[PDB]
Design a binder for this molecule. Structure first.
Ligand SMILES: NC(=O)c1ccc[n+]([C@@H]2O[C@H](COP(=O)([O-])OP(=O)(O)OC[C@H]3O[C@@H](n4cnc5c(N)ncnc54)[C@H](OP(=O)(O)O)[C@@H]3O)[C@@H](O)[C@H]2O)c1
Length: 244
């Protein structure tokens, strides 16, 4: 009968896991590498590996609550669920949209973000986690500010960088203090959507700073279950029921 796989990595995901556990769903949470469900860690081994997992574990439903920029995991979930007739929905918020006072430009990927930075040395907040920071070594004249969940193993791949180690979630006061104190001139961010990571954008607006926003990657179509209640509804509409 019902056995959920929740692909995590965000706050939508952690909150969702808590709700599922409260309601009594048989569910496993998964991270690539804050909630009480039994958690698997690490990749599945491509689409075939995920197919094998779904089949061996008798998964009935997948909820993809991965970050919107975890596009390989999302695309693999589409393919694997399609190959096994397992129901899938994505728990994702809509992208952020600009308002008055926002100074935003958009680029399609991380490479284009690097290319978008000015020639003259700037002070750039790379608000994009740990992945692919190296890419910015192709614009080595800038000062970079990083914010990382864990202390970096080795030396930063960036000629001039400072890493602040923190998780948050972050407040507008906090982010405005950071940007101000590091005299940031530009912010690079991914268009994640949601309230949880939006502080840095309000802070930027407050300080009158430009943001280079990386647009969401393309992922194949699947059902979208964009609030906790939407997820509960979709679960019931696909015959998922809790313990007992
Ligand atoms: N700071 C931001 O707001 C922001 C924006 C964009 C990206 N980033 C970071 O850069 C990231 C790209 O992330 P990513 O490497 O996690 O995504 P990914 O490129 O989609 O994942 C790469 C592989 O890791 C495994 N994987 C990912 N999520 C998993 C999960 N929940 N459970 C099991 N395996 C998982 C899968 O390997 P297998 O094929 O072997 O299953 C997947 O194909 C974004 O997720 C984000 O967190 C951050």
């Amino acid at each position: 009968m019902t056995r959920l796989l929740v692909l995590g990595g965000t706050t939508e995901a952690s909150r969702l896991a808590k709700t599922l556990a409260d309601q009594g769903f048989e569910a496993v949470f998964s991270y690539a590498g804050a909630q009480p469900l039994p958690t698997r860690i690490g990749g599945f081994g491509g689409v075939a590996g995920l197919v094998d997992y779904l089949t061996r574990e008798g998964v009935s439903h997948v909820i993809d609550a991965t970050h919107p920029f975890a596009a390989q995991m999302s695309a693999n979930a589409v393919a694997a669920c399609a190959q096994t007739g397992v129901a899938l929905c994505a728990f994702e918020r809509a992208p952020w949209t600009a308002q008055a006072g926002d100074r935003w430009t958009h680029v399609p990927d991380l490479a284009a973000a690097v290319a978008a930075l000015p020639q003259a040395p700037a002070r750039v907040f790379l608000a994009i986690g740990k992945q692919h920071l190296r890419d910015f070594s192709a614009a080595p004249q800038h000062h970079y500010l990083l914010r990382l969940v864990d202390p970096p193993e080795g030396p930063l791949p960036l000629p001039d960088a400072r890493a602040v180690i923190a998780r948050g979630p972050f407040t507008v006061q906090g982010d405005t203090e950071l940007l101000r104190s590091e005299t940031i001139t530009h912010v690079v961010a991914k268009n994640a959507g949601g309230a949880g990571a939006e502080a840095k954008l309000i802070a930027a607006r407050s300080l009158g700073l430009p943001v280079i926003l990386i647009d969401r990657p393309a992922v194949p179509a699947r059902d979208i279950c964009a609030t906790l209640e939407g997820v509960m509804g979709w679960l019931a509409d696909h015959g998922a029921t809790p313990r007992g």
